[PDB]
Amino acid sequence: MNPIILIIILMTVMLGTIIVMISTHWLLIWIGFEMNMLAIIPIMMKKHNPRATEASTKYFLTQSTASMLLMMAIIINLMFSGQWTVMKLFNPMASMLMTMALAMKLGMAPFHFWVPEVTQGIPLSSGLILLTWQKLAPMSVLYQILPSINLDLILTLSILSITIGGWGGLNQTQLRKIMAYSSIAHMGWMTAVLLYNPTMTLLNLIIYIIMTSTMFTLFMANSTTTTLSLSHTWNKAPIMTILVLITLLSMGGLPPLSGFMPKWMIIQEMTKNDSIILPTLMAITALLNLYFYMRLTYSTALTMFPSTNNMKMKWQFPTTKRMTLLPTMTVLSTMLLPLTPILSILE
Amino acid sequence: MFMINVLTLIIPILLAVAFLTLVERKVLGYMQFRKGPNVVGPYGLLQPIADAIKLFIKEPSSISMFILAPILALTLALTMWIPLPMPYPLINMNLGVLFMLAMSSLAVYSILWSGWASNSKYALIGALRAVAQTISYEVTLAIILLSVLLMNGSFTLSTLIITQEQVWLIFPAWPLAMMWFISTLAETNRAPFDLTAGPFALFFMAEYANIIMMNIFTTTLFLGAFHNPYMPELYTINFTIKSLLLSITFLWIRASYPRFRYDQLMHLLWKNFLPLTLALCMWHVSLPILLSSIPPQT
Amino acid sequence: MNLMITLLTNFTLATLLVTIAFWLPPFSMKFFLVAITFLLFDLEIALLLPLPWASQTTNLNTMLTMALLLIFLLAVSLAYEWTQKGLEW
Amino acid sequence: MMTYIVFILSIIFVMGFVGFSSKPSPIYGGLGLIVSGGVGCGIVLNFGGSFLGLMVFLIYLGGMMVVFGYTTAMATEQYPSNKVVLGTFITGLLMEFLMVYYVLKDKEVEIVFKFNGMGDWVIYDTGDSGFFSEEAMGIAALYSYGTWLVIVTGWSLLIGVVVIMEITRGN
Amino acid sequence: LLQAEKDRRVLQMLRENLEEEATIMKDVPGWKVGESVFHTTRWVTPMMGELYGLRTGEEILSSTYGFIWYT
Amino acid sequence: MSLVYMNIMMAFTVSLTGLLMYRSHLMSSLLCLEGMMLSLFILATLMILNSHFTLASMMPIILLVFAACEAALGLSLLVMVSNTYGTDYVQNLNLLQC
Amino acid sequence: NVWAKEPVLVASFAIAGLAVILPTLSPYTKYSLMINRATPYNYPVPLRDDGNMPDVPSHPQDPQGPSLEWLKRL
Amino acid sequence: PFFDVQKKLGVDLDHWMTIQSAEQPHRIPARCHAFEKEWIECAHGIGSIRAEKECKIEFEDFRECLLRQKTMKRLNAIKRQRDKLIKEGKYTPPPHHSG
Amino acid sequence: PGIVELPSLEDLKVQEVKVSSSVLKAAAHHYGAQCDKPNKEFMLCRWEEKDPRRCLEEGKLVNQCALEFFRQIKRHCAEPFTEYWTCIDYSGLQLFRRCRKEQAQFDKCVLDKLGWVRPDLGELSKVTKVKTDRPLPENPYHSRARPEPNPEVEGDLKPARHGSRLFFWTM
């Protein structure tokens, strides 16, 4: 765990993701997914508990079978019309198994069984880097091979993923599993609008990664895992709590706050197509996955739990961490309401 | 006449190995002050034939795996004299040197199978260590093979016997030859690189056929003779004489030097050979591109 | 089928020898570095080894440079574990 | 002793894959995968195949199952087999033999394809003048063309070395 | 010269195999007698089945499988 | 259609099921993954041979070296699992609950 | 000195350094590339003759075309 | 995101690994080289949908080149008819060795 | 759909120069020297129009040129060319360092009685001019013209129209 070695491994994460971005060849995309796996494994098990051991094992098996199924889809693609371009493919079977492999990759309701497990027993920096980069990786892929996908696959994945993230989530006590289930629901959202306009998908990717960076930066600012320590951080620091208030309500996506803008524009360009019952059922589920956000905000900032002392002893001592960039990213993530024609940034 | 070619290949391996055992026993005896075996049998050939039939007599895992280990060792020992270019090779294989190396790796498989088969003992942990010291040299031997065929075009080995007949390959690389020689010492698994149970005669047979395979391949690789065509007997006699002398020199080094320590063995291998191998091999890459003599693959 | 016939004859002779024989009567972590270290250097051997089949091309400077980068990268890895107490006991 | 030799070697290839995919003890599974890799290397050499299948054979049956037997031997013993393995092997042989019958004595069976039922000596090239044995120069690329590919491959190998030593307690 | 002999010989096999097909399929429904499977009238390289069909083992194994496992 | 491709794809599906269903040890599932790797190798290789796609023949060797270092990472994880427990079970993993 | 501390490693660095540097000066680099380029593997097709180019003889015995002679001249 | 480093910095790192008609080290074609060249020039300046509307002729030609699916279908029909009429037992064949 | 037309044996009843390839390799430089000027008619015909059933009469032309060359080497100098090919016959795959003395004797033969200097290495190279009686062909890949070019939207951009035309925030 030398800092030179960790800067090297961060450079490999960056390099694997950029190879996923720029390479028009399928083999190099598979190599990029593999190299990103190989780099993200020693980010986890930064400690040496068996928790991180089991977490990295489960994540290794899931990412490995995703990589193998992707290579299967590419080999079937060249058994059919065979060219090494990232283009509109020429097989329902190959695109079928490829979307299933990407569902293994980014997590869907068929394939979400590893996510709260691997996100619980790890440090939060590892959870941040895995969530941000491993959900940024398939978006380039979908953004380039949208025109040859049977829509029922991704639609069933999206519906079922958002309703599993709605139902699973109202019972948990760990913040890591809360953020994991939220990642499940929002990746279902950001995958749902693929075959109509990928602009909404990419912009929602931007907004969600900014939100998760702010959230996990706040939870780096206090080594907390349950609501109890969150109330203790209320009793030692007030401004963290109003940050939790505003950011959690933006994760709820409420119209004066910036998190509603990726929802609302998705509803716009999904309901200019004349299917209505499916977007409003998905928006009912987006109502449904706000309860745990709200009770979390209750137990942090708005209700006040009693506390044990020695926080008096902590009061002489500053909250003297350094942040990567917390406040700038927070006010970007929350006060971004009148910047709706910044949708036009893409093309 | 193909099965008769098979007979002429695999019949003399038994007499060859048994007479190699008497030669190494007599030459160890003369390196020591021991005449013999010469009492029972004229110059002791009856002594190895009685060794073979006696070790067949003197006989009392998971019977499947217990058979699967020596059957693999013995079928490799049989099937791996095929592309040997004693003047006209048996099958003119387009590539056979990596075939040699892959079947050496299969010999490592058979050793690991017997190591699991030795029935759950500190013996088998020592056998796993023997697997480790065996596998620790196929890196260096393959990279040296790559360098010594890098001056030789391709794997085809008859083009090698064309390139050798002008001057011997010992002069373009003598220290690389000595390092490959030490690698063959380590891969053949005898003294000073030791150590570590039935059938003893068949395992005995497999190891000595491995050593004869490496000896004939060594005498092939780094020397030769002027090959006058339409009489293969000339090159056959001269190559056989020099393979005899090389095998005698190999036993002669097997006789007289103490064994190594295991951590000395690994430390010696990695931190003494392996940067030196890399420097010699990058030099063998950089040489023909600067001397305007790259070998013409057909 | 030539190699198949040779394999058949050697296998049947091996079975005849074995039937004549047998029908006529807790670990170390430091062990684990060796196997994977061996395998990764064998992988870089697999990267190096198509060079003598390749050495007759026009773009020879590119060949020489990428060959240098391959051997130098193998040297960087070996010197890394060399300095950082890897192959020690 | 007949013409469908590629087909029969493919049959024994699937036989071996079933023979270790019925979940035995893992060293017997490694034995089965060694036999399966041997017959698959025989398949690719019987398409000729003279270069590449025997070429990467050293890495797979020269490098992989050795290390699998290594890490299987030093892990545990599994000294007791079970009826589930034999039942799964019989069901795999059932699927194999049923496909054999409905392909050999019939026309076609389609998962989503159209498998024309005959042993494929055809298609095959019409003896065209290579003289360089296409596999040879094919894998003998990467040095006049392959700039980026060897760079990222060696990068991943270097990272694999440092990853293995770190996780197995770097330094 | 080997190119010219090869082309003349494969055209001879094609003429003989069209004679074969003109003999054998006199009763089948459908079946235009000389269908190329493709659309554009260009010369396609044959697939060794059109060159050597119904040979039953010997010459096909010599012309295809001989280089693969001989010498 | 080259009928051998049918049984190699069937062999892939059998190796895939042997990857996914597994009861006792991780080594068996990882070995079935290695056999699946071999299956993809052989299938793409026979494609390139009979198709004479001679230009980019990098696929079999590069597929195998990359999925090889994948398998090496998997063996590292299994050795870590066997160290922090007594066995390498599919069981003894109910901690870090779901 | 620095020599016999780790002597085989220093010797390897020396021979590897000259193996790196030695391509930067040689009297046979361009000769090597011309000899390698001057070997016809692919078959030379003819063409529709020319529009009177100062090259390309009819009989290849005629030395009007650009050909090699230093193959025999060492 | 499809970045334009490939089209911007000019280094064509992957514009040779892609399909054929690029210069092989020894310049040989594959089985479907002309069909590749014709299909690619049919679908160059095309937004991939009227490629499916219009270049379907060359697309199906290229696919039956790459597979010979209906070719082996017709050949197996020939073989089955040959098998049933040699079970019938007519004309001990002078396609081979004789006339 | 599209049937073909294939030519009969009306032109495929032609005697061949059926010698072995070893003696033909022994006659490489000389047969390439005097003859093989109008076989590049056949070569140009084939590499422009890739049709066999097109350039076959020039196949007869090169066949009778080789027959002419073989009768000329048979009748005239000499007989120890027979000795030369039976010298180079049993040397596995033939080189030209193998039977050098009889090669020099055959050189002295052909130089003293006819001429025919061996071309220097590597003159049997060097892409060579040829003109024909036929005109050079057209559109040999039988396809139509490329159907629809993209209508290239031209004209410089107008300024912004009514701001954004989203729900509000004009300008």
Curated annotation (Swiss-Prot), chain A:
Keywords: Electron transport, Membrane, Mitochondrion, Mitochondrion inner membrane, NAD, Respiratory chain, Translocase, Transmembrane, Transmembrane helix, Transport, Ubiquinone. One of its GO terms (biological process) is mitochondrial respiratory chain complex I assembly. GO terms for molecular function: NADH dehydrogenase (ubiquinone) activity. Core subunit of respiratory chain NADH dehydrogenase (Complex I) which is composed of 45 different subunits. Interacts with TMEM242. The lineage of its organism: Eukaryota, Metazoa, Chordata, Craniata, Vertebrata. Coiled coil: none annotated. It is a multi-pass membrane protein. It is found in: Mitochondrion inner membrane. Core subunit of the mitochondrial membrane respiratory chain NADH dehydrogenase (Complex I) which catalyzes electron transfer from NADH through the respiratory chain, using ubiquinone as an electron acceptor. Essential for the catalytic activity and assembly of complex I. Belongs to the complex I subunit 2 family. This is NADH-ubiquinone oxidoreductase chain 2. InterPro entries: Complex_I_Subunit_2 (IPR050175), NADH_DH_su2_C (IPR010933), NADH_UbQ_OxRdtase_chain2 (IPR003917), ND/Mrp_TM (IPR001750). It comes from Ovis aries. One of its GO terms (cellular component) is respiratory chain complex I. It comes from the Eukaryota.
UniProtKB/Swiss-Prot annotation, chain B:
GO terms for biological process: mitochondrial electron transport, NADH to ubiquinone; mitochondrial respiratory chain complex I assembly. GO terms for cellular component: mitochondrial inner membrane; respiratory chain complex I. It is found in: Mitochondrion inner membrane. The chain crosses the membrane at residues 2-22, 63-83, 95-115, 142-162, 167-187, 197-217, 233-253, 274-294. Its EC number is 7.1.1.2. It is an enzyme of class 7 (translocase). This is NADH-ubiquinone oxidoreductase chain 1. It comes from Ovis aries (Sheep). The gene is MT-ND1.
UniProtKB/Swiss-Prot annotation, chain C:
One of its GO terms (molecular function) is NADH dehydrogenase (ubiquinone) activity. GO terms for cellular component: mitochondrial inner membrane; respiratory chain complex I. Keywords: Electron transport, Membrane, Mitochondrion, Mitochondrion inner membrane, NAD, Respiratory chain, Translocase, Transmembrane, Transmembrane helix, Transport, Ubiquinone. It is found in: Mitochondrion inner membrane. It is a multi-pass membrane protein. The chain crosses the membrane at residues 3-23, 31-51, 60-80. The keyword Ribosomal protein does not apply. The keyword NAD applies. Its EC number is 7.1.1.2. It comes from the Eukaryota. It catalyses: a ubiquinone + NADH + 5 H(+)(in) = a ubiquinol + NAD(+) + 4 H(+)(out). It is an enzyme of class 7 (translocase). GO terms for biological process: mitochondrial electron transport, NADH to ubiquinone. Core subunit of the mitochondrial membrane respiratory chain NADH dehydrogenase (Complex I) which catalyzes electron transfer from NADH through the respiratory chain, using ubiquinone as an electron acceptor. Essential for the catalytic activity of complex I. Belongs to the complex I subunit 3 family. Core subunit of respiratory chain NADH dehydrogenase (Complex I) which is composed of 45 different subunits. Interacts with TMEM186. Interacts with TMEM242. This is NADH-ubiquinone oxidoreductase chain 3. It comes from Ovis aries (Sheep).
From Swiss-Prot, chain D:
Keywords: Electron transport, Membrane, Mitochondrion, Mitochondrion inner membrane, NAD, Respiratory chain, Translocase, Transmembrane, Transmembrane helix, Transport, Ubiquinone. InterPro entries: ComplexI_Subunit6 (IPR050269), NADH_UbQ/plastoQ_OxRdtase_su6 (IPR001457), Nuo/plastoQ_OxRdtase_6_NuoJ (IPR042106). It is found in: Mitochondrion inner membrane. Its EC number is 7.1.1.2. It catalyses: a ubiquinone + NADH + 5 H(+)(in) = a ubiquinol + NAD(+) + 4 H(+)(out). It holds the Pfam family Oxidored_q3. GO terms for cellular component: mitochondrial inner membrane; respiratory chain complex I. Core subunit of the mitochondrial membrane respiratory chain NADH dehydrogenase (Complex I) which catalyzes electron transfer from NADH through the respiratory chain, using ubiquinone as an electron acceptor. Essential for the catalytic activity and assembly of complex I. Core subunit of respiratory chain NADH dehydrogenase (Complex I) which is composed of 45 different subunits. This is NADH-ubiquinone oxidoreductase chain 6. The lineage of its organism: Eukaryota, Metazoa, Chordata, Craniata, Vertebrata. The gene is MT-ND6.
